[PDB]
Amino acid sequence: GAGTDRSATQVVSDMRVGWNIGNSLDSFGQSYNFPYTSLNETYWGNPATTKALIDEVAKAGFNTIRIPVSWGQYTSGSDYQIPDFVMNRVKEVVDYCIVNDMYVILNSHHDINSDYCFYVPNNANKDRSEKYFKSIWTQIAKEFRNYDYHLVFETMNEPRLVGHGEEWWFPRNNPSNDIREAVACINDYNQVALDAIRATGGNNATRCVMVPGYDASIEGCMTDGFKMPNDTASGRLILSVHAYIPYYFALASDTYVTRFDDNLKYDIDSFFNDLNSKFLSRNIPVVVGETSATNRNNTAERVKWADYYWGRAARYSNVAMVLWDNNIYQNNSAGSDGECHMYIDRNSLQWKDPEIISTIMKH
């Protein structure tokens, strides 16, 4: 019963390194089947999360778990009501982590995708989008109102225009009018979500909250139009950013590289220099909620990647990072697939490349 009397800096400072439960509760089905009346946790091929799994992740040295959840697909009625079988399960998984003295980041994940969007960052959809966020966050925050500062809320995942030319990228300094509209909409959606959480009172009056910009990318947050929402609490906001960098080494599936060349350290360096000048040096901590380098059968290179990434992050007390893990390991023989992010095999509970894990824990 420790309450939430800790600043965002004090929380992020005590986070060492995190691990995502990827392709689990974020798994979604098709909108014509809505609302789902049973869990899609195993829909994308992964075993339901066990205490045993979270225990091994803890034992490896992770003290933070990010739990991506796609809520929308289960909701019913005009107030987007979340069914108890969903809330109960989410609480089950949160508690696996909480009882191991771990930090937990709970979010809304694939509530947008190619199939159906529960929110859209444009003016035509502003009304239903804000209604969605207010509704789910009222419910989620009430469920977990009595959790201490270990539980952080992340308002949304990678808000964007789905199926748009600029869904996954735009130049921070030259936003199109569609992107400008999205950026402003996202500012307002973060505000609504934060207001919703705050309004339930109790520990939620002062819980730390993570908020992303467009795509949760460095562009989204660095672009001049991005705004941190207005809080009634002091120093309780954390910037959410996702950074699979360097892109061609870590994520690309077409034109990729397998070597972590010294030239690529510039990508990580500038990434942090940007975060530093705009956020970290202004006492706004940043959580890199997702990062990973896909398995291209290049373990030694991925060690170099991890060593540098975490070594570079280590100098910023108010930075913490979280590995993305989708429980998929095998790449083709070219190593071209950018979606092989297994670190621990969820079926055997064995680590795939312990050299990478050990290298992260050195920092």
Side-chain angles (χ1 to χ4, degrees), residues 1-15 17-78 80 82-126 128-252 256-303 305-361 363:
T4 49
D5 292 305
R6 272 175 195 227
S7 74
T9 304
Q10 278 156 337
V11 174
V12 173
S13 299
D14 198 46
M15 287 174 182
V17 64
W19 184 82
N20 275 275
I21 311 173
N23 281 9
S24 194
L25 287 165
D26 40 323
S27 305
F28 62 86
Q30 304 71 36
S31 63
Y32 53 73
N33 290 324
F34 293 174
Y36 277 84
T37 53
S38 67
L39 285 162
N40 284 326
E41 184 177 359
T42 55
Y43 188 53
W44 286 358
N46 292 321
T49 296
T50 62
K51 179 61 159 54
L53 173 57
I54 301 299
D55 285 352
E56 289 308 303
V57 173
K59 284 162 49 177
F62 295 92
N63 78 335
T64 303
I65 303 291
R66 179 157 175 270
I67 308 178
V69 183
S70 297
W71 305 91
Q73 62 184 318
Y74 303 108
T75 61
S76 64
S78 77
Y80 302 95
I82 298 156
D84 289 341
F85 77 93
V86 170
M87 209 56 102
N88 293 346
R89 178 58 176 155
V90 173
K91 185 186 183 293
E92 218 162 277
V93 178
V94 169
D95 290 342
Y96 294 165
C97 309
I98 296 292
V99 301
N100 289 345
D101 306 303
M102 279 179 284
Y103 287 83
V104 169
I105 298 163
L106 180 63
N107 87 354
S108 148
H109 213 74
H110 294 317
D111 286 331
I112 56 170
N113 56 60
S114 282
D115 179 87
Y116 182 83
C117 293
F118 279 88
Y119 61 93
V120 182
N122 60 27
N123 294 328
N125 292 276
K126 212 169 187 295
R128 74 170 181 109
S129 297
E130 294 177 354
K131 172 57 171 297
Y132 179 74
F133 286 122
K134 186 205 284 186
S135 304
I136 63 164
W137 281 113
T138 297
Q139 294 173 79
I140 304 171
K142 279 189 199 144
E143 173 73 4
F144 296 92
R145 183 163 51 207
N146 299 326
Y147 282 65
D148 63 24
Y149 56 80
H150 283 98
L151 180 59
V152 172
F153 295 159
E154 175 184 313
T155 58
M156 56 198 79
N157 183 38
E158 291 176 352
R160 65 199 188 270
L161 295 168
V162 169
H164 193 275
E166 305 169 277
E167 169 173 14
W168 296 112
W169 195 91
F170 73 96
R172 64 186 74 172
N173 292 319
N174 203 22
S176 59
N177 285 321
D178 289 339
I179 287 293
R180 288 181 59 225
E181 187 177 346
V183 165
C185 283
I186 292 160
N187 290 341
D188 290 335
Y189 299 165
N190 276 326
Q191 185 67 65
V192 172
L194 176 68
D195 294 352
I197 295 157
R198 290 291 183 250
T200 60
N203 287 347
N204 294 333
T206 54
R207 181 175 316 285
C208 297
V209 174
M210 282 167 56
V211 295
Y214 192 92
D215 285 330
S217 72
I218 187 68
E219 309 301 323
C221 67
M222 295 303 305
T223 195
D224 303 337
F226 171 78
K227 307 180 192 320
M228 296 294 289
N230 300 117
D231 205 344
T232 56
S234 172
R236 300 304 207 270
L237 296 183
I238 303 168
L239 175 72
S240 174
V241 61
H242 296 180
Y244 298 82
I245 58 179
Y247 174 75
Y248 295 113
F249 174 81
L251 194 65
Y256 63 100
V257 294
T258 57
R259 278 190 53 245
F260 182 70
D261 184 280
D262 280 338
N263 291 295
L264 293 188
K265 292 170 172 180
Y266 185 80
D267 296 28
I268 288 142
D269 248 72
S270 57
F271 169 75
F272 282 119
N273 288 342
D274 286 350
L275 290 180
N276 184 59
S277 78
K278 190 172 172 171
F279 295 97
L280 305 173
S281 68
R282 295 185 175 274
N283 294 102
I284 300 171
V286 176
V287 168
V288 190
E290 289 183 25
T291 190
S292 184
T294 184
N295 168 44
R296 306 188 189 278
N297 308 122
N298 58 339
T299 292
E301 301 298 316
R302 288 168 77 219
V303 160
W305 167 83
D307 196 47
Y308 188 85
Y309 210 154
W310 267 263
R312 192 56 175 69
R315 71 176 66 183
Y316 313 94
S317 175
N318 49 352
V319 163
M321 311 204 299
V322 185
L323 272 180
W324 177 250
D325 184 317
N326 60 0
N327 200 41
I328 295 160
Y329 191 73
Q330 301 292 323
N331 208 321
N332 57 65
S333 52
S336 63
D337 192 68
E339 286 296 313
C340 300
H341 300 292
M342 181 191 297
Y343 290 88
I344 182 169
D345 188 299
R346 283 180 214 181
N347 300 280
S348 57
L349 301 186
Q350 313 305 290
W351 295 92
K352 301 304 295 183
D353 297 276
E355 301 88 349
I356 298 168
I357 305 307
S358 291
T359 305
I360 290 177
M361 303 301 170
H363 304 285

